[PDB]
Homo-oligomer: 302 residues x 4
């Protein structure tokens, strides 16, 4: 079986462990710096193997060397711009341990701001560029897809959409790349099934969804976890899904030496393909704004 | 639980019963005119409830009144243009029994030529237009999607495509409506990841797939069954999937008083939406050719 | 689709909503008395329909009349013996609203001490005895089954076991009723694959598991949620699983007028069968101790 | 991904390929000696990746060297006692190719009489004893479990039962080892929920089920396929299920140098445990009769 190490056993970590057992995806280590909490979560979660018909070990850890043997490492560890150097130090520490203990693992970074943190961990861990990605577009687009599906009264997964550049407030929502059952969304607009003004409000809701959830006295963690597991599952099972993730750009969109959100194909070799959308000049200008903000924050991270 | 009656317990019927138990979708009746064969298939299939963790009854029947209580009726019963009046007589007979025993059932017609047979059964059963559809586009597009996915090395379901008008040799393969991970296929052509000539060969392979399978000394029945169950499941579970099926046209594409293939939304109310693609004049001319052939065959069916 | 109302949107409520969407079981209402928190959790969870390929609405509520239309109601609402009258008052309030708004719903009670609270809600809601059960044995036995499976290196679900009488410290762990792959556990003891002393330590661990998790700075909520969803799913899908739950006793084990834990069969009619284990006199004496403690606490609840 | 080679692409082979794609278990090769038929079945089945959300290659083969790289090999190839030397010759041929091309594969033998054929293939292939098993008990017990579940109105999987010794007419149906929800069946008999006479009729039905299906003008192949896939899945996913299979006996039950049916644990190391039921002297005498018949037939196979 695969060994999946969750570096960070907080809110997202707990849901990931739950879903991994539900899906029987592999053995799980809940790693954290907080003493014994991961052992407690692991114990609770382990019992769900019975209900789920699964056979995944779930263990807790406070010991970095339990990274040894990991096939997948998912980094949610962390805790304004003031946090950037603190979370950088966490990425440095984790990277040194990945390099030593599991240099061949597939790495998914979640810690915000993710497009910065994923590149910092790439640098500190030394893993190949096809073996480390960041969460962003699967989550952001799940929101956009879902909101459109409820307006159009269709199955949520039948809406497809692209959000690129970065996770966070500069995300680029590409109206031209929305489809419903594979059909351009513009046909539905033309038929007055959804209006341009409705879509503008949905776009703004998508950008502000994390804030909306926080203002309702909750935290966004279940959908982030589910998005991460969709990514990890595509790797583990060699599904070769097209999923939008933060990945190293090497000239796509006119950008290099930086990570940003774009469709990729995830399978057994990691990032098997980086797909470059054929953006028009106006869309590219928005992409550039997203990259500029990643670069601004990266400079502050040290 | 739902009661699903398979009117026709041949090759497609057997796989449908298998998949219904796998998915725990409902109780199954394998109905046929052949004596005892459906009882034998039902007995074999019923044991798979243990392996599948399901609880679906599977029974055989030679008695039409076992249609009573059906929530879903799937018609594969049947056996050149010479067959048209013989299969019409089968649709007449089945329709009379549906009208009497299960007028509120959701009906899926499979018997070829499906766009003719579905309308004949609509007429003979009296069910509402939102409660009867024919298999076509889910199956035809599964082939197109699959062949493209193997060229592009992506997950099969991540290719979406539209084939409309009719099932059979006049099916309309809409190049403009192919996407990969929600991205227009033309971007992949522009990047020389797949060529126009490759796609032409894939289109011809799609049209001729049933013949290809027969020439390899096999029969097309597993994918037809899986396509039908995808449709039935969307109804039973109120998924509201966008699925291309044969449905009554009431002016879409300039056509009325005939069934043809188009995207529809399938949920608990049956056909909840008929989606009309905004075809251009050249695509519409191909659609017209498909309808004309359905009409030609319908006239021969009596 | 089914409508599932989670009366209580805390830790267990959140995981239940997650699992319901994963399993596409029905629309979900997260109801709570805390303002807006359920709306926030509902919003986060709703996005997972995309990742899960599901179509379940997830809404929050602070309005009791949203119980109207519920097919299943799961009660986790609540917050030593000092709490008994406070949680009784919560059961009274919920019961009045169930009686008015959804008297035909299937009710699962979770609030501790569950064997007391389930009967109080039965009394206050007026629902039939086959339509209300309490969580206990599925959860307690998941722990016992799991711990044994890890010693014997077998699939967790292949261990079966019975814990009866009550949830909590007087639970009756029935050594005679443990099997592995359907084989009596005693054969494995005879073969020195597990010893009697190992099993004694596992029994004590099972009884004290909730305390163990709390002492590790965690809370038991994921496995409780999964156990509840196994119960709810058996009802919704008419699986007729044998599951140990708290149910009204009408003479079984020599007890009436009280709820206690025993195997039941859960299907579309609710509790379709109450199974009475043929306990020996010594096992019965332990059962009596469990009932006595439920009665002691019920008297304090008012 | 795993590579699963189906040596034999007939009735059972076709269903296995269908189920492997449904479960996304691995790439599939349909191998047969019949020209092109496996290619045709493979082509049909491959399209179901779209409906199933899977990514399994399905190919046909007439070339034995396509065994190279196989992780799992499932042998259904074959076609009274007169057939024994003909099917032996098929096992010899297959064994030579396994030894050359995939000596590290996990092998499941199905060809009848399975307890003879599995040992012949063990001998001819040279694989280790923990890496080759025969289908029998999962299938025979699925029938027994199912029939009892329908009498008792419980979920089929909640009945557990043991049938040992051999597949075929000398199978040993162990009344003492039947449970319902983990409870001895005798408690249900004592409660007059099922009688001893009913169980005798169910036992006879179980022994004669293949004949019953054939006499109904059908063939037993769907449940055999599902049983085989349950076994293969337990290996591939390291589930460590307890499953009754034909395996090499090394003194269990007083028998050596022969294969017979007994519970085993199947996981990533193949047969991880052989479980010896603690049979009484009368049960052992029936076990001996089953082994004697395997030995009689093996002698005739050459
Ligand atoms: N990329 C995206 O789309 C999203 C990113 N996020 C980010 O994900 C991160 C995690 O979010 P939650 O799980 O909700 O937070 P959380 O606060 O519940 O969990 C973070 C955990 O990291 C642990 N931690 C701190 N230093 C560590 C170290 N060196 N090694 C291991 N563990 C360590 C903490 O003790 C804590 O348990 C945050 O940075 C958040 O902003 C959240 C949602 C979406
Ligand atoms: N719409 C589509 O995309 C496709 C349609 N088809 C069509 O589906 C149909 C079924 O195909 P298979 O299952 O492979 O054929 P099959 O020949 O195996 O099964 C047809 C069954 O219908 C039964 N039957 C005849 N009259 C009947 C009656 N009055 N009531 C009930 N059963 C009756 C037969 O005895 C036979 O068992 C054929 O018409 C075939 O051309 C096949 C593949 C795809
Ligand atoms: N039966 C069993 O096996 C188990 C029972 N439990 C019990 O389950 C209950 C819930 O546990 P958690 O979810 O972890 O607790 P929690 O404290 O996270 O959630 C309880 C929720 O109930 C809400 N609430 C209070 N009064 C309410 C009302 N009138 N209507 C609706 N909501 C109301 C609270 O605001 C809170 O959000 C507790 O009583 C706990 O002891 C926990 C585990 C196992
Ligand atoms: N162990 C058990 O519980 C059960 C065993 N069986 C046995 O399973 C076997 C298969 O049954 P079905 O699939 O229904 O039969 P089938 O006749 O449909 O398929 C057998 C296939 O083996 C092929 N074959 C013959 N020689 C071959 C070779 N050297 N290499 C590869 N393929 C070759 C044939 O061409 C045919 O396609 C039979 O021996 C049957 O008695 C069937 C049911 C249960």
């Amino acid at each position: 079986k695969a060994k999946i190490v969750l570096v960070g056993s907080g809110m997202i970590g707990g849901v990931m462990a739950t879903l991994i057992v539900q899906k029987n995806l592999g053995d799980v280590v809940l790693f954290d710096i907080v003493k014994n909490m991961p052992h407690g979560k692991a114990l609770d979660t382990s019992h769900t193997n019975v209900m789920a018909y699964s056979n995944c070990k779930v263990s807790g850890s406070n010991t970095y060397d339990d990274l040894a043997g990991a096939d997948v490492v998912i980094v949610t560890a962390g805790f304004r711009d003031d946090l950037l150097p603190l979370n950088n130090k966490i990425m440095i520490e984790i990277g040194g341990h990945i390099k030593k203990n599991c240099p061949n693992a597939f790495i998914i970074v979640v810690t915000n701001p993710v497009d910065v943190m994923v590149q910092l961990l790439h640098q500190h861990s030394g893993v190949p560029k096809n073996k480390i990605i960041g969460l962003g577009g699967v989550l952001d687009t799940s929101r956009l897809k879902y909101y459109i599906s409820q307006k159009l009264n269709v199955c949520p997964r039948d809406v497809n959409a692209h959000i690129v550049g970065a996770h966070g407030n500069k995300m680029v929502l590409l109206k031209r790349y929305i489809t419903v059952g594979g059909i351009p969304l513009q046909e539905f607009i033309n038929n007055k099934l959804i209006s341009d003004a409705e879509l503008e409000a949905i776009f703004d809701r998508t950008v502000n969804t994390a804030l909306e959830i926080v203002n309702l006295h909750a935290s966004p963690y279940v959908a982030p976890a589910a998005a991460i597991i969709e990514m990890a599952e595509s790797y583990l099972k060699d599904l070769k899904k097209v999923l939008i993730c933060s990945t190293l750009l090497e000239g796509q969109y006119g950008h290099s030496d930086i990570f940003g959100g774009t469709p990729v194909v995830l399978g057994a070799n990691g990032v098997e393909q980086v797909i470059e959308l054929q953006l028009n000049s106006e869309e590219k200008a928005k992409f550039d704004e997203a990259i500029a903000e990643t670069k601004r924050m990266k400079a502050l991270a040290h």
